[PDB]
With several copies, the nearest count.
Chain A
């Protein structure tokens, strides 16, 4: 599911954050 897409978006987003 959608929750656990959202969690594995949040791996990607936090480690994109790491240039921000």
Chain B
């Protein structure tokens, strides 16, 4: 019902995006961020794979690794490139966690990310034309 509508909307969003159309503004942001993440990881394939292979992840230290990376990524400011890196980092951190059988971390990571987006990135995004502008720039 709610579940069924969610499935329908996901599929239709995909189909529409394939034809250069969009279900909604949120759907356009989701897809742009997906593609920006791909483009970032492609353009810097070696370096991205290089430092992600240096990730040393354990359940007890996962948050510390997350925070050390993120606070350094945004140490002197925000820009969209850093925002894309933040997502790609969280993605890589989730995969690397599953890569080493630590799946309980994935939902924690999502929450740490959502909180950092809300508390520390949202103020900048809103002063810089919002996610709609990112969709424009991409």
Main secondary structure of the interface of A (DSSP, over half): helix
- Asked whether any CB of chain A lies closer than 8 Å to the CB of B48, the reply is yes
Decide if A10 touches B72 in the complex (CB within 8 Å).
Answer: yes
Cα–Cα distance between A14 and B75 once the two chains are bound (Å): 12
- Asked whether any CB of chain A lies closer than 8 Å to the CB of B73, the reply is yes
CB under 8 Å from chain B, chain A span 1-20? 1-3, 5-14, 16-20
Chain B residues with a Cβ closer than 8 Å to the other chain, count: 28
Residues in chain B near residue A17, CB distance under 8 A: 79-82
Residues in chain A near residue B107, CB distance under 8 A: none
B interface residues (Cβ-Cβ under 8 A, vs A): 39-40, 43-44, 47-48, 51, 54-55, 64-65, 68-75, 79-82, 84-85, 89, 137-138
A interface residues (Cβ-Cβ under 8 A, vs B): 1-3, 5-14, 16-20
